[PDB]
Design a protein around this nucleic acid. Structure first.
Length: 441
RNA sequence: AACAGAGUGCGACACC
DNA sequence: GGTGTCGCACTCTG
């Protein structure tokens, strides 16, 4: 039905509006041959059929180059990645344009709740390399070659491709303004308001992409769904849920017995902190067991449990509405700041994110009252990363508006941040649910 | 043994 | 007590 745009059918891609790239070198560089690292029978055999599939496909061509860098295949078959730090250090740097994965969804309007997701197959290869630059990307072989397209391992590949595709799509975006199109480099979210208003765009877009010369995986496609996985998340109805996959990777593991094992834990669980109320404080007992003896007392096990429990009971987050205002409820506890950034849908405050930070050494040194102010300060700063300086009412269990206006060091800076009334208004003192951190009637 | 971007915790150097 | 630059963990997205 759409043979052109499906990699599985319409064959390898080529960004047609995109003219072959010429990679600008450092003003002082020099070709570098580098000994093809040894791999193994499984690695050599892993990317073996790939280096052969690409060859007769033109993407790969017989070459004789000063430069050699060793290819570094991977897996999850194998990827034809290529270890080339030596090259891309001899290559100049460019002002980047890759999206901020943190706030991309901030731009998904609740009006739009019909979703499609298209992952792009072999995106980088859709860009052509200009024969001048082709040699930089050479590697030995047996059964020396090089890339006619844009290879993985190359430091600019990510940005170069974002721009290419972003530019190629700037057309669409103005022409179907009734649709939303988020783009994280390689893969795309389309948002409609209607089951068919989605199936239009998903026809148009899916077409445009075939024309422009890009191809999308029909395997990984997610067409006109009411919920979709995107960026590690489940999106459904303008809310962001943690994936059961994500959870299993924590629940599943055995209680850490080394610092390394602890670090992996805090590592992956910390990627869920937006869904864990008073996270930072929760994990306080765990942190010192990194770097340092490893005594696993009750507090360690308490934290450990609490955190895992907090994942099972984890709530959906509301996607930030930038056309509305936000409230930030905040509390401070023994040197730890915690709070929930919320927005209203009718009669409901619905959390947009949970924010917590360990109070730094000096702050932590100040008395309870002052601590609350610093608590309010950091979380406000962090909330900014989501609100985009949209107007924010700050609420808390202890009144502090006065003190930030009439204190008897850092204040100067805190006052500056908190007393800009064009973005920050204190609200009334309120009582919070100790869990959920929401206000009590 | 590769890249870009992101989250958070810890340290080091320097500076009044 | 305050304040500026780095580096090293673990983790995630593609």
């Amino acid at each position: 039905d759409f043979p052109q745009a499906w990699a599985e059918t319409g064959g390898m891609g080529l960004a047609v509006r995109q003219a072959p790239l010429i990679i600008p070198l450092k003003a002082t560089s020099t070709p570098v041959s580098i000994k093809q690292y040894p791999m193994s029978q499984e690695a050599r055999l892993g990317i073996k059929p790939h280096i052969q599939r690409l060859l007769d496909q033109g993407i790969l061509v017989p070459c004789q180059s000063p430069w050699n860098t060793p290819l570094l295949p991977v897996k999850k078959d194998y990827r034809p990645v290529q270890d080339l730090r030596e090259v891309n250090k001899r290559v100049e740097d460019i002002h980047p344009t890759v999206p901020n994965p943190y706030n991309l969804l901030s731009g998904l309007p609740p009006s739009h709740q019909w979703y499609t997701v298209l992952d792009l197959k072999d995106a980088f290869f859709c860009l052509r390399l200009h024969p001048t630059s082709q040699p930089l990307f050479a590697f030995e072989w047996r059964d020396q070659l090089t890339w006619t397209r844009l290879p993985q391992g190359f430091k600019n590949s990510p940005t170069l491709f974002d721009e290419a595709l972003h530019r190629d799509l700037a057309d669409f975006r103005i022409q179907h303004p009734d649709l939303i199109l988020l783009q994280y480099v390689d893969d795309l979210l389309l948002a409609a308001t209607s089951e068919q208003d989605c199936q239009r765009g998903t026809r148009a877009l899916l077409q445009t992409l075939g024309n422009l010369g890009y191809r999308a995986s029909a395997k990984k496609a997610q067409i006109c769904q009411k919920q979709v996985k995107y960026l590690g998340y489940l999106l459904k109805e303008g809310q962001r849920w943690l994936t059961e996959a994500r959870k299993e990777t924590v629940m599943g593991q055995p209680t850490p017995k080394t610092p390394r094992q602890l670090r992996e834990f805090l590592g992956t669980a910390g990627f869920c902190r937006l869904w864990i109320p008073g996270f930072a404080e929760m994990a306080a007992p765990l942190y010192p067991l990194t770097k340092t003896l490893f005594n696993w007392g009750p507090d360690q096990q308490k934290a450990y449990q609490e955190i895992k429990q907090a994942l099972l009971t984890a709530p959906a987050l509301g996607l930030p509405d930038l056309t509305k205002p936000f409230e930030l409820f905040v509390d401070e506890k023994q040197g730890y700041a915690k709070g929930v950034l919320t927005q209203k849908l009718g009669p409901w405050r619905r959390p947009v994110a949970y924010l917590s930070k360990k109070l730094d050494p000096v702050a932590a040194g100040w008395p309870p009252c002052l601590r609350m102010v610093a608590a309010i300060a950091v979380l406000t700063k962090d909330a900014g990363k989501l609100t985009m300086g949209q107007p924010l009412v700050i609420l808390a269990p202890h009144a502090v508006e006065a003190l930030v206006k009439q204190p008897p060091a850092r204040m100067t800076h805190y006052q500056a941040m908190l007393l800009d009334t064009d973005r920050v208004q204190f609200g009334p003192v309120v009582a919070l649910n100790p869990a959920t951190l929401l206000p009590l009637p």
